[PDB]
Design an enzyme around this catalytic site. Structure first.
Site, PDB file in Angstrom:
ATOM      1  N   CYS A 111      -0.964  -4.229   6.076  1.00  0.00           N
ATOM      2  CA  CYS A 111      -1.711  -3.436   7.055  1.00  0.00           C
ATOM      3  C   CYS A 111      -3.238  -3.647   6.970  1.00  0.00           C
ATOM      4  CB  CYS A 111      -1.296  -1.968   6.961  1.00  0.00           C
ATOM      5  SG  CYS A 111       0.493  -1.675   7.118  1.00  0.00           S
ATOM      6  N   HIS A 164      -7.931  -0.895   4.979  1.00  0.00           N
ATOM      7  CA  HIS A 164      -6.984  -0.033   5.681  1.00  0.00           C
ATOM      8  C   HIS A 164      -6.688   1.254   4.886  1.00  0.00           C
ATOM      9  CE1 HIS A 164      -3.686   1.412   7.966  1.00  0.00           C
ATOM     10  NE2 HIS A 164      -2.844   1.266   6.958  1.00  0.00           N
ATOM     11  N   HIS A 221       0.839  -1.221   0.000  1.00  0.00           N
ATOM     12  CA  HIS A 221       0.000   0.000   0.000  1.00  0.00           C
ATOM     13  C   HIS A 221       0.861   1.253   0.000  1.00  0.00           C
ATOM     14  CE1 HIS A 221       0.920   0.017   4.178  1.00  0.00           C
ATOM     15  NE2 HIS A 221      -0.048   0.819   4.563  1.00  0.00           N
ATOM     16  N   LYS A 261      -5.636  -7.004  10.634  1.00  0.00           N
ATOM     17  CA  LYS A 261      -5.675  -6.201  11.831  1.00  0.00           C
ATOM     18  C   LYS A 261      -6.491  -6.955  12.877  1.00  0.00           C
ATOM     19  CE  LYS A 261      -3.223  -2.543  10.989  1.00  0.00           C
ATOM     20  NZ  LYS A 261      -3.865  -1.533  10.107  1.00  0.00           N
ATOM     21  N   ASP A 304       5.392   2.822   5.484  1.00  0.00           N
ATOM     22  CA  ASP A 304       5.825   1.545   6.049  1.00  0.00           C
ATOM     23  C   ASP A 304       5.915   0.409   5.037  1.00  0.00           C
ATOM     24  OD1 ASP A 304       3.021   1.465   6.095  1.00  0.00           O
ATOM     25  OD2 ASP A 304       2.887   0.509   8.079  1.00  0.00           O
ATOM     26  N   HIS A 308       1.340   3.859   1.991  1.00  0.00           N
ATOM     27  CA  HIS A 308       1.973   4.386   3.202  1.00  0.00           C
ATOM     28  C   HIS A 308       3.478   4.091   3.285  1.00  0.00           C
ATOM     29  CE1 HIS A 308      -2.081   4.700   5.609  1.00  0.00           C
ATOM     30  NE2 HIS A 308      -1.886   5.729   4.803  1.00  0.00           N
ATOM     31  N   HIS A 346       2.024  -5.371  11.704  1.00  0.00           N
ATOM     32  CA  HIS A 346       2.358  -4.864  13.036  1.00  0.00           C
ATOM     33  C   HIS A 346       2.046  -5.786  14.206  1.00  0.00           C
ATOM     34  CE1 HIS A 346       3.031  -1.164  10.915  1.00  0.00           C
ATOM     35  NE2 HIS A 346       1.804  -1.228  10.430  1.00  0.00           N
ATOM     36  N   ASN A 369      -4.512   2.715  12.401  1.00  0.00           N
ATOM     37  CA  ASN A 369      -4.651   4.062  11.833  1.00  0.00           C
ATOM     38  C   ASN A 369      -5.797   4.147  10.810  1.00  0.00           C
ATOM     39  OD1 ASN A 369      -4.166   6.702  10.679  1.00  0.00           O
ATOM     40  ND2 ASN A 369      -2.793   5.745   9.176  1.00  0.00           N
TER      41      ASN A 369
HETATM   42 ZN   LIG Z   1      -0.813   1.873   6.269  1.00  0.00          ZN
HETATM   43 ZN   LIG Z   2       1.060  -0.018   8.780  1.00  0.00          ZN
END
Ligand SMILES: [Zn+2]
Ligand SMILES: [Zn+2]
Length: 218
Positions: free
Chosen positions: A156, A137, A75, A159, A79, A77, A195, A165
């Protein structure tokens, strides 16, 4: 002083890389990605947050005889995309979805050199499949499936303990996306979230449950 990049074997031909960034008010958060071996060649599933850790990751495998064939970012983001600039600067092929590159471009970020779209995309035929469950996400989140090992990198999107987030999340769509993911990959042996710790196919159900709960309370 951030914790060191960590690289450790998960299964035959599959390593988990973990990198760390401070983000408020979470404290230090680990980010897991994969490195997948295809004979003497290596593919990055997500990049670390930074050029420096991307370099360390690449060098670790290069020094052990593996040529880096490409990276895929799950994705937009940081990270998942923090190493794209570095990898591009070294002429290592980067991959992201067409929706991921559009979100990068719009946000003033360097884009993956290659893109794809559709429900399913073979990065490597029969070895590394990219699947788009739908928005969750983020609008662009994809997952990566390793059919030979029954390993799903969920990034991400997975979850199981809480959605995390919500800034760029589609809470209306996530249940349907999570439902589709579960039905597609309930055969998964290992599910690797971004995570939290590696789990089994139950993480898919837990994610669906978390998505449903999050939708209801909004
Ligand atoms: Zn993300
Ligand atoms: Zn993330």
């Amino acid at each position: 002083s951030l914790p060191d990049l960590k690289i450790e074997k998960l299964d035959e031909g599959v390593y988990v890389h973990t990198s760390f960034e401070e983000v408020n008010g979470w404290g230090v958060v680990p980010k897991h990605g994969l490195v997948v071996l295809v004979n003497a060649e290596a593919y990055l599933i997500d990049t670390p947050f930074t050029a420096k850790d991307t370099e360390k990751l690449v060098t670790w495998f290069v020094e052990r005889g593996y040529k880096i064939k490409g990276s895929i970012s799950s994705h937009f983001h940081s990270d998942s995309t923090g190493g794209i600039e570095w990898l591009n600067s070294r002429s290592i092929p980067t991959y992201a979805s067409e929706l991921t590159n559009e979100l990068l471009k719009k946000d003033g970020k360097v884009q993956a050199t290659n893109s794809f779209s559709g429900v399913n995309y073979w990065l490597v035929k029969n070895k590394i499949e990219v699947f788009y469950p739908g928005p969750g996400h983020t609008p662009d989140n994809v997952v990566v499936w390793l059919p030979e090992r029954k390993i799903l990198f969920g990034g991400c999107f997975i979850k199981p303990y809480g959605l995390g987030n919500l800034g760029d999340a589609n809470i209306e769509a996530w249940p349907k996306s999570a439902k589709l993911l579960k039905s597609k990959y309930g055969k998964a042996k290992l599910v690797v979230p971004s995570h939290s710790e590696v789990g089994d196919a139950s993480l898919l159900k837990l994610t669906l449950e978390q998505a449903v709960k999050g939708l209801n309370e909004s």
